[PDB]
Each structure stands twice: as structure tokens, then as C-alpha cells.
UniProtKB/Swiss-Prot annotation:
The keyword Transport does not apply. This is Outer membrane protein X. The keyword Signal applies. PROSITE patterns: ENT_VIR_OMP_1, ENT_VIR_OMP_2. It is found in: Cell outer membrane. It holds the Pfam family OMP_b-brl.
Length: 148
């Protein structure tokens, strides 16, 4: 049995003018030595904050917790699909002191590929999609790590 731990930059974009929002992603994958089928869990977090000249301030945070099956195609490539929950927390302050916060969970799902350019190294690329209330958040991920 082996495990693969990867991490890297994540970047979210929602339909509706909610520009790019940067963060990170971590995945923990587990494989058995004698089956191509394993499991992978994924943690994603992005955020963006903005303060206008008017004094107004906005802060958006996105969390995605997903997991699913991972299939090893050959020695250097595997594919995976994940499902779970997405959480969005949106903070807004109308200067000087009017605040309004909203948060809610939604379904999240994703798919990715992991390459092993050397047996102990992993290059991970995935996309994650969540629907929180009516906003659709899409997040691209590129990570790296070790298999051990
Ligand atoms: C979106 C990407 C694809 C989603 C990955 C789904 C991968 C699920 O597995 C598909 C293949 O089925 C697995 C085989 O388990 C049997 C192996 O042999 C067992 C030991 O004797």
C-alpha cells in the first residue's frame, strides 16, 4: 500500500462578476499494491477580499471537501472523480458600519488526473465545481507532492 500527498495553487471563478479568487488545494490518495482502484480525498480553500475607495469591503471564502474513487491507468497516470460539499461565506460591509454576511453549503464535485514522472513524485491537476444557492463556483487546481 502507498499514499500520495499533493498540494498546490487553486483558483476559483464564479459565473456573475466575482473575479478570480486564489487559494490552495491538498489531496490525500491511498492505493493498494494489488488493485488499480483506490481512494482520494480533497480539501480546497479559496478567498478574495476587496476594499473600494468608497470604504466598502467584501470578503469571499470558498471551501470544498470532496472524495471519490481513483483509478491507476498505468505506472505514470491515474484518473479520479470526487463528490462532496462546498461551503461559501460572503462578507460585505457598506462603510462605515453596515455589515451583511451570508453562508451556505452546496453540492460539490470534481475530476482530475495525477501523473507520476518518477515513482515517488506526483503532479496533480483537477477541476472542482460547486453550486452554493444560485452561484456556480468553478476552481482549477495544479498541485505536486510525493507518493510513499
Ligand atoms: C472522472 C474520472 C473517472 C472517475 C474515476 C472512476 C474510477 C472508478 O474505477 C473505475 C474502474 O473500476 C475499478 C476496479 O476494481 C477492480 C480491480 O481488481 C481488484 C483486485 O482483484
Amino acid at each position: 500500500a502507498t499514499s500520495t500527498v499533493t498540494g498546490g495553487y487553486a483558483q476559483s471563478d464564479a459565473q456573475g462578476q466575482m473575479n478570480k479568487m486564489g487559494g490552495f488545494n491538498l489531496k490525500y490518495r491511498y492505493e493498494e499494491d494489488n488493485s488499480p482502484l483506490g481512494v482520494i480525498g480533497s480539501f480546497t480553500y479559496t478567498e478574495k477580499s476587496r476594499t473600494a475607495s468608497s470604504g466598502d469591503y467584501n470578503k469571499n471564502q470558498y471551501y470544498g471537501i470532496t472524495a471519490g474513487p481513483a483509478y491507476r491507468i498505468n505506472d505514470w497516470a491515474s484518473i479520479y472523480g470526487v463528490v462532496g460539499v462546498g461551503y461559501g461565506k460572503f462578507q460585505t460591509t457598506e462603510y462605515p458600519t453596515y455589515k451583511n454576511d451570508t453562508s451556505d453549503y452546496g453540492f460539490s464535485y470534481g475530476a482530475g488526473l495525477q501523473f507520476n514522472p518518477m515513482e515517488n513524485v506526483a503532479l496533480d491537476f483537477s477541476y472542482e465545481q460547486s453550486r452554493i444557492r444560485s452561484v456556480d463556483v468553478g476552481t482549477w487546481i495544479a498541485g505536486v507532492g510525493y507518493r510513499f
